[PDB]
XYZ file of N, CA and C in Angstrom:
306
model
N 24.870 19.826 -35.613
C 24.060 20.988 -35.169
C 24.459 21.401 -33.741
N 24.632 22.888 -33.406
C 25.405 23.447 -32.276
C 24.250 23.443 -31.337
N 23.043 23.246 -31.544
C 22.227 23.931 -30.173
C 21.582 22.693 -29.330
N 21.673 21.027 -29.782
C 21.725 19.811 -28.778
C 22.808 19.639 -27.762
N 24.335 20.243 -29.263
C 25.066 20.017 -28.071
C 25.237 21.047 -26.722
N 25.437 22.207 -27.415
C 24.819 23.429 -26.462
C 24.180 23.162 -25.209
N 22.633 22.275 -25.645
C 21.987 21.577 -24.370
C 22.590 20.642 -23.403
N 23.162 20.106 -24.112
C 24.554 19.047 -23.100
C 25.475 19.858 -22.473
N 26.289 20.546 -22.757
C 26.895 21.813 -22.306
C 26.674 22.637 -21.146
N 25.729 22.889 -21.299
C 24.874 24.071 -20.329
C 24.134 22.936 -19.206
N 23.825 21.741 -19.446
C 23.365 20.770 -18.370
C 24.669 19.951 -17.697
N 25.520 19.556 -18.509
C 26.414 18.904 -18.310
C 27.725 19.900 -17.270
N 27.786 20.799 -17.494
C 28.489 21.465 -17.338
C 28.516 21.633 -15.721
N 29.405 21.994 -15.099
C 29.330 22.450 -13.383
C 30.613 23.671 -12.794
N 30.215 24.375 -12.160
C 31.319 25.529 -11.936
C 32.371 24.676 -10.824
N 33.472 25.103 -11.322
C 34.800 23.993 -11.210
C 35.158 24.657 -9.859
N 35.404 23.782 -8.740
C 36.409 24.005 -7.425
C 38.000 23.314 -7.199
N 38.783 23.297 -7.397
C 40.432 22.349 -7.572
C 40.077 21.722 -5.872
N 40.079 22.587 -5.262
C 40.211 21.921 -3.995
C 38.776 21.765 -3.107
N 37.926 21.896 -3.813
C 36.682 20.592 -3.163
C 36.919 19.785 -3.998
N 37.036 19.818 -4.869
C 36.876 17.855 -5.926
C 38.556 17.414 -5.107
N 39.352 17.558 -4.666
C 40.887 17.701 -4.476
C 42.037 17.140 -5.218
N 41.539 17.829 -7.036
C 42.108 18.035 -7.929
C 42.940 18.846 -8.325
N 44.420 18.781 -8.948
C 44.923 19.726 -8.918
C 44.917 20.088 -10.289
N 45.358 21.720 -10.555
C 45.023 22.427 -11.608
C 45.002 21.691 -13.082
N 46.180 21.132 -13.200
C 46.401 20.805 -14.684
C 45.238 19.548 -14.560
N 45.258 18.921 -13.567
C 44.236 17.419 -14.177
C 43.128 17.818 -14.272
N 42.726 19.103 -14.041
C 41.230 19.728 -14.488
C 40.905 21.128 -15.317
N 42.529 21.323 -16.197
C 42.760 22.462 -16.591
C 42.254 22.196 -17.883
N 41.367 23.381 -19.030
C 40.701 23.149 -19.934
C 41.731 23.646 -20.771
N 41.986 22.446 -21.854
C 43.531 22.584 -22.744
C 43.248 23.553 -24.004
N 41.962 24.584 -23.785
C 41.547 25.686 -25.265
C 42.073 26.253 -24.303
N 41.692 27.223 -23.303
C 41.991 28.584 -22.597
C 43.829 28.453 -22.098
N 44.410 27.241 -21.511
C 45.367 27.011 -21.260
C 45.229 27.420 -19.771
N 44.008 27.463 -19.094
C 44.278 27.262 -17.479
C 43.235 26.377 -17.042
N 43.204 26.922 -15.503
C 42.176 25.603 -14.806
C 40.877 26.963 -15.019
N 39.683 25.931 -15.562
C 38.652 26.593 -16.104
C 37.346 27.146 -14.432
N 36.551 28.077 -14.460
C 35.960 28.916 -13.522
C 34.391 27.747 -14.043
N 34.398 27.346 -14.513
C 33.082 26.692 -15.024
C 33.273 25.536 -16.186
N 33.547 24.639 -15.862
C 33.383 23.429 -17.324
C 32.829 21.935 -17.647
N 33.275 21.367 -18.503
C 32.163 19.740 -18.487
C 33.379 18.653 -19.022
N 32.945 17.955 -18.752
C 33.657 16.529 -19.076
C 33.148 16.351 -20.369
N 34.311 15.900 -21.417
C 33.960 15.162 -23.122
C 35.391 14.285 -22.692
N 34.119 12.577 -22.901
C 35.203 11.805 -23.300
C 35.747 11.454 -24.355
N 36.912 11.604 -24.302
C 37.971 11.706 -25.201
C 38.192 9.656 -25.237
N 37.129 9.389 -26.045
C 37.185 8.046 -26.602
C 38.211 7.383 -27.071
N 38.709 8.273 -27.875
C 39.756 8.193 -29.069
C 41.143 7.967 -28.103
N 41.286 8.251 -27.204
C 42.312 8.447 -26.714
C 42.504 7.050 -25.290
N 41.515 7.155 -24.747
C 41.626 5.777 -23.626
C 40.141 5.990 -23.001
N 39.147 6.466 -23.407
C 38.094 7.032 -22.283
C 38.061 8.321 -21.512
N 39.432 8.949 -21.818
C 39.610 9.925 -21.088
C 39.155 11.228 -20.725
N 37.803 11.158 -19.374
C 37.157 12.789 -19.321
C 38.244 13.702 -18.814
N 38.003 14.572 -19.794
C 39.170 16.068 -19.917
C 38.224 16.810 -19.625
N 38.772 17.875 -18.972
C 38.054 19.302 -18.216
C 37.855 20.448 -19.283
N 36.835 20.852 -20.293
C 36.625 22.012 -21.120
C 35.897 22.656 -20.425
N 36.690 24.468 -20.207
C 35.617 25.560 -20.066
C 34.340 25.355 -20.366
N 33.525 25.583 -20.134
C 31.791 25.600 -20.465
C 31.611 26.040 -21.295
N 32.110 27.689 -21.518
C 31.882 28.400 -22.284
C 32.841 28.355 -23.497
N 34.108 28.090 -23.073
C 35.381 27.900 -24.323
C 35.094 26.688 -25.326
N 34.083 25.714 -24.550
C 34.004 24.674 -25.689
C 33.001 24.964 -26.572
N 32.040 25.490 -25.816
C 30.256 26.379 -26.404
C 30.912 27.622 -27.458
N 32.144 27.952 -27.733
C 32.724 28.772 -28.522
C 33.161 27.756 -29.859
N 33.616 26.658 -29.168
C 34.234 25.949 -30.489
C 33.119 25.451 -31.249
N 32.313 25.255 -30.714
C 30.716 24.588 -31.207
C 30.230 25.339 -31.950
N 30.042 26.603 -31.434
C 29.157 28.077 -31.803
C 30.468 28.294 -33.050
N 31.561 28.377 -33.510
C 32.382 28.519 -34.981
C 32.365 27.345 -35.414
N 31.936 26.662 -35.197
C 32.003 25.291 -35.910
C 33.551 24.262 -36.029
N 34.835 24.768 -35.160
C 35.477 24.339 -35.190
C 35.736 22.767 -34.342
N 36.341 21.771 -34.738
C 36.345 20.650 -34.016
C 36.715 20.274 -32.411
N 36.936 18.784 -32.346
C 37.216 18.951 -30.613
C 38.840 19.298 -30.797
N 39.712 19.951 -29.891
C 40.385 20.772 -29.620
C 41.817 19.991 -29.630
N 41.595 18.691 -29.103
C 42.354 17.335 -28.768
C 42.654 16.316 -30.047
N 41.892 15.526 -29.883
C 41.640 14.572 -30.796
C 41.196 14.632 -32.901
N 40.639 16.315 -32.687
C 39.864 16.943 -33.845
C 38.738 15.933 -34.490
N 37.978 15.206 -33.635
C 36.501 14.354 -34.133
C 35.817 15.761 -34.029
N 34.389 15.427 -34.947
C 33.012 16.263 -35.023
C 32.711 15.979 -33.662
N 32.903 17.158 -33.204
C 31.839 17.282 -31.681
C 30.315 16.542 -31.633
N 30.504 16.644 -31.086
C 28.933 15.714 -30.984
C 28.199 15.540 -29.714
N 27.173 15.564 -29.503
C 26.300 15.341 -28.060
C 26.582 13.740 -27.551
N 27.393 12.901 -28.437
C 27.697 11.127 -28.347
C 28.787 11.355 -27.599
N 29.966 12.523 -27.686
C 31.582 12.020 -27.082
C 31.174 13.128 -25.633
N 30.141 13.906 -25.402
C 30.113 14.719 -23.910
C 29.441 14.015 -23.574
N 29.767 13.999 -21.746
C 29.011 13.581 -20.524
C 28.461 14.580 -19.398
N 28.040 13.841 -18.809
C 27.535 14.554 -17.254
C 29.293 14.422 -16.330
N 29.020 15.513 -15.657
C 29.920 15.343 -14.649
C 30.060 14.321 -13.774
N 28.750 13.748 -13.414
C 28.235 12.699 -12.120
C 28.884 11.314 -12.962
N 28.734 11.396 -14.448
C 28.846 9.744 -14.861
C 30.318 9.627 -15.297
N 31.284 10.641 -14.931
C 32.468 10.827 -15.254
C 33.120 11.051 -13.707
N 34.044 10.177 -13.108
C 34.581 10.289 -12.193
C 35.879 9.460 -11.860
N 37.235 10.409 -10.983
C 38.359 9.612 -10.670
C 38.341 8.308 -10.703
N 38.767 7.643 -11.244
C 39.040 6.156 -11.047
C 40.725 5.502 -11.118
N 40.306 4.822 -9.843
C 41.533 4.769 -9.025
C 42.839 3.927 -9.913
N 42.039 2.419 -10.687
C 43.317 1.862 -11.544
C 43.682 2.304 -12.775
N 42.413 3.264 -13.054
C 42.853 4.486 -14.506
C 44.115 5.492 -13.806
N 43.631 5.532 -13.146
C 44.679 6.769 -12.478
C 43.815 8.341 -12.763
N 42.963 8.097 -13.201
C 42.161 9.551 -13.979
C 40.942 9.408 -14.041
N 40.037 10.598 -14.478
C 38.894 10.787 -14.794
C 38.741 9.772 -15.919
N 37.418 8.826 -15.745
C 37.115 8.259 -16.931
C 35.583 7.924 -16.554
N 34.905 7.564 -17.311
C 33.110 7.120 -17.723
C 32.795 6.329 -16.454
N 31.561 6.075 -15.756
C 31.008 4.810 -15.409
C 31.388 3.913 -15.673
N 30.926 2.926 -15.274
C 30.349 1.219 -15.912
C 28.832 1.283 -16.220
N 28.161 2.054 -15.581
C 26.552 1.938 -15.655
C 25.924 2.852 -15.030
C-alpha cells in the first residue's frame, strides 16, 4: 500500500545541499532522475551491503504512486527497506552512507 510509505517519504525525506553535508554529486545523486536530487530520502538498499542511496522525494513517491518496484535492487518497496535521514549516515570504514547501530 502507497500511502504508509508515502508517510515515510514525506517525513523521511530532507531538501538535499552537496556542499553542506560535503558530499559530492554522484554519492548523493538519485539513480531514477539521473542527477543530484533538489529534495530526497535514504532507502536502504539491504540487498546490496546496507547501502543508503539518495532517491528524489518526489521521483521515488512516483515509483510508489505507479506501483513500480525499487529502481536498484527491484524488491517491493516497502516502509521496512526506507529510513530517516538522521539514522542513515557517512560511515567512515564503510566508506559510505549506511544505517546506525542503534
Amino acid at each position: 500500500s502507497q500511502e504508509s510509505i508515502q508517510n515515510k517519504i514525506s517525513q523521511c525525506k530532507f531538501s538535499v545541499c552537496p556542499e553542506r553535508l560535503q558530499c559530492p554529486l554522484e554519492a548523493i545523486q538519485c539513480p531514477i532522475t539521473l542527477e543530484q536530487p533538489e529534495k530526497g530520502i535514504f532507502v536502504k538498499n539491504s540487498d546490496g551491503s546496507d547501502v543508503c542511496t539518495l532517491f528524489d522525494a518526489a521521483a521515488f513517491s512516483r515509483l510508489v504512486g505507479e506501483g513500480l518496484p525499487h529502481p536498484l535492487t527491484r524488491e517491493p518497496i516497502t516502509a521496512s527497506i526506507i529510513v530517516k535521514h538522521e539514522e542513515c549516515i557517512y560511515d567512515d570504514t564503510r566508506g559510505n552512507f549506511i544505517i546506525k547501530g542503534n
